[model samples]
Target: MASMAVSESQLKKMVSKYKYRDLTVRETVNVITLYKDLKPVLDSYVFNDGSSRELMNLTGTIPVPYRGNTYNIPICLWLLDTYPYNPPICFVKPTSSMTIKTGKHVDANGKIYLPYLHEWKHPQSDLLGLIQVMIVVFGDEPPVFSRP
Candidate 1:
């Protein structure tokens, strides 16, 4: 899918929808800024339980510096309504041509796990920092591999 540019107004409107109405003004702005910086597509995310919510789904790649090289690691970051306070539901979204590398930080389903997420705090913890952590961790132990 092509990346879509979202204006603050449009973002605000979408965020003001029913499920997201509980987010504070500060939380709202934080989301907007994150979207502006990351350019992730905002959409409805359906959970395994068949429930859904409006979320910021970043289906793209983050640059990870590894053993004398840089790798563009594909990932999907799902920012839930209770963001900032809650860490995003992260996953290593490998393309059809790629495969998942199950290891310490990633699982067979491509779900991500990290200390940052376990210790997430509202005022300080944010999506940007989480992503930075992902880069560093993935650099040391990549979560996906190119299929030969």
Candidate 2:
């Protein structure tokens, strides 16, 4: 099947429906900022730990053109309990049928590498930007070598 993009309306609907539940004042503010910034590239929203009370989850699936075909690159961001103060932990979540690509930054485990992650800051760092950059970084598509 071909890679798909989520509609803006759907993105907004999902965002409002599943936003972090039982959040403190700080967490609520952070989540709102995140949802605001990430709506365009977002696929859907879910909780990292299966509960609304959890830190929250953002899944980004960017379609990369490669070798006359398109590949859907998915990444997950987990907003930590100490978000803003600390960077959200992220990974390239390869499906069971997908092989994790090996590269200068990505390892066998699908961990990604980028300069922004090295200098991550609270107000300065944003997960939306990271995924956008990642979509561009994989624009050429060699980093994600699809195979059996």
Candidate 3:
């Protein structure tokens, strides 16, 4: 593989600028303020126990595109009382097998698709902890789920 020369800060600034910087938006179970200096949290999480996907239970998460991988993403879980009450509170909505056509909470229809509810675990991994995590982590924005 080939690469171009660039300063660490430059690259950080670049990604941060596009991905996290100036990213301030708020909605039900939706709040994303990038540039919150998530280094400490990310560094600790990735380096420490290498916590399980479970580690992100309610801790919130952010979907980042490091090289070029598209994971709906896991953002912090906070401020989303409007999300229809469920593990999948965040409305980032992911396009996955787990999501149904419903626009509201996970009623019996959605409940039928539950994945064991891990502190509000939606069967739709595509959401990838979008609304559930994004709110708490930093209210980071999510473009993973497209709801109507």
Candidate 4:
């Protein structure tokens, strides 16, 4: 329930102190504004190599319109230090009440695979745009479903 609004100053200080921060002032502002809308949690994310770095993690749900119904699909977006230039690592983090659908767009491990991510270009590509694309793609073939 990370619903509290983080002050812009706090976020600024956090990113300033981040170890691998390559975000410019404008990029940082972009992230800050995006976080205002998504309210992502800032934490240390561990990679497969056992290395870790502070990242903005969006552990929440996105509204998707499917079959005349709107479903809240839980997901996780890990913003990398090289974001905008590189797409975030997207995944479907299904709750206990749900299970992964595992389709062409989403794997069994919940990792997302999309052309938008593979062909990401900075300035034109952004986190908010990525989520909007996810909503459309997932609406057509959802990444998860309620557990029976």
Candidate 5:
């Protein structure tokens, strides 16, 4: 865990969330743990709890630098109720400048799959690892649509 960078305000913001306030024992641990772990890496991402507070979503860009040009992959994640035990359902939100096709890791629906998510284990698999897995999986760069 990246234990040193977590800030007081970060925790406060986390605590202010409805889900954080109403967390089950398992949920509390999982939420707080990831709040701290994910804060630093997700600088460009935007996070929000649904208006009704029924769910949480994280949207951000993953930049893959190939030979010279960089490919930016936009992603979104919806936090599930049974999050610790189940993986957050994630999708690749394609941008106007990008072209994508579904395959092994991501599909036409933008849904994603990773070994860690498919084989989740509480206190073991976390969002930080999930992002890392995506980085590796998409490292070489995905098939982008050609320019007009």
Candidate 6:
């Protein structure tokens, strides 16, 4: 829990106050799994309601740097393509030792912006990179078999 960037209190606040744009079963599962480990930047950009309901299409590699590995999570972002944000996600092969620590946001122009910004970087993307980050980090982290 301490290892995660976002605090539990913070996550509860976001869930209790900040409205999630929206998400489906799949997307919702991801959010429920994560949300506690994302960095501050990513956590702040989260929207759990209508935002994820879009379920567009994702295609790319999400960098995960941990201990000494960089795992490229082959994933796609779909804020509106599917019923939920099921942007085809797959941990790319040749996965490095590290897990994705954090990253910038991907914009409508298909451009990734923000450095260490995490969470969907761009405002409109509304993909909730923050939720993704927390899920991947905390879920994968062993020490604690946790849930919120």
With a 3 Å backbone cut-off (N, CA, C), the pairs that clash in candidate 5 are: none
Local accuracy of candidate 3 as per-residue lDDT tens digits, 1-148? 3232333443334334222222211121122223221221111123246652211112333445433453434323322222223443222223354333342223323321223234543234323344343333322332333344
Could you list the CA RMSD of all candidates, in the order they appear? Answer: 4.2, 7.9, 16.3, 3.7, 6.8, 13.9
TM-score of 2: 0.57
TM-score of every model?
A: 0.77, 0.57, 0.18, 0.81, 0.62, 0.26
Candidate with maximal lDDT: 4
**Candidate 4 lDDT tens digits, 1-148:** 3443665566556566544455533454454455444545778888999999888766777778898888888888877766556778989988888889987899998999999898888768777678879989998898998845
Q: Candidate 4 — what's its lDDT?
A: 0.74
Give the range of the ten consecutive residues with the poorest summed lDDT in model 4. 19-28
In the range 1-148, model 5's lDDT, one tens digit per residue, is 5564444455335444434334323343443355442322222323455233345455556666656776666777666545556777787878777767667877776778778788877668766677767877777546344365
Candidate 5 Cα deviation (angstroms), residue 132: 0.9
- Looking at model 2, residue 25 earns an lDDT score of 29
Q: In model 4, which residue pairs have backbone atoms overlapping below 3 Å?
A: none
| Regions of candidate 3 where Cα sits further than 4 Å from its true position | 1-76, 79-88, 93-113, 118-148
Instruction: Point out the worst 10-residue segment of candidate 1 by lDDT.
Output: 17-26
Order the candidate numbers by lDDT, best to worst. 4, 1, 5, 2, 6, 3
Residue 57 of model 1: what lDDT?
Answer: 62
Residue-wise lDDT of candidate 2 within 16-133, one digit each (tens)? 4333322222343343354442222223334557554434455555566666877777666665545555655667777777777778767786767778778887566765566666
Deviation (Å) of 73 in candidate 2: 0.9
TM-score for candidate 1, please give it: 0.77
The best-first sequence of candidates by TM-score reads 4, 1, 5, 2, 6, 3
Better of 4 and 5 by lDDT: 4
Which stretches of model 6 miss by more than 4 angstroms? 1-56, 81-125, 131-148
Candidate 1 accuracy as lDDT? 0.71
Q: Tell me the deviation in Å of residue 109 in model 1.
A: 1.3
Highest TM-score: which candidate?
A: 4
For candidate 4, report its TM-score. Answer: 0.81
